[PDB]
Symmetry: D2
Subunit: 66 residues, 4 copies
């Protein structure tokens, strides 16, 4: 459907976010995992904004419609 949850993950260098986990890979890189919930369209747009940022690599969005 259009409503559900999603997992956005990416490596670095809003009422949509349920929880976000930051895990350090090394001195320069942080692995970030964000659990999102709401309208899948708003979820995609959130991921869009994140992936558009410099320093953000390997962005992946796993959608989980209800």
């Amino acid at each position: 459907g259009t409503q559900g949850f999603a997992v956005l993950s990416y490596v670095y260098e809003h009422d949509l976010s349920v929880a976000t986990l930051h895990v350090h890979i090394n001195h320069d890189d942080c692995l970030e995992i964000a659990v999102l919930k709401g309208d899948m369209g708003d979820v995609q747009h959130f991921a869009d904004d994140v992936i558009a940022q410099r320093g953000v690599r390997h962005g992946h969005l796993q959608c989980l419609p209800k």
Copy 2:
């Protein structure tokens, strides 16, 4: 390569695990996110064992080789 990190995510109902996050979706379902690190082969085998379990659905493994 063969060594790096990985993000295994799945909905429910080892020295490989760096951190695991459990988030409740509702009364019956828990979204689980596991951050793994080590040999990508051991990582895949870990995911294999998890996905083979009854009650585990929508399993996804995102690999991040160094």
Copy 3:
């Protein structure tokens, strides 16, 4: 008050849980952090059950009333 959030943390070896994080300290010990929300009385009882378990050490409950 009686309703709010709480952080239960402990070292190892329900609709109350919002999210739980497991972090490995070493081969034998896992640091677990549980974010709880609901009636502070139910929260305390949840922590009670966890701390009563063998293998669970250094249990600490930080309450955050609304």
Copy 4:
């Protein structure tokens, strides 16, 4: 001892951080839990810097010496 792990938790509005979890309480407040590891002195200083920030409330540091 002086080396070990620690859990720093606080409500909002480095090679020391192992993992950090952000959980939304509501529109304005985010509950943040940081798992730290290293010299307990460096850990305390990290917590000091965080708690000194405006908007940061209910800061608590649970130390876990090895």
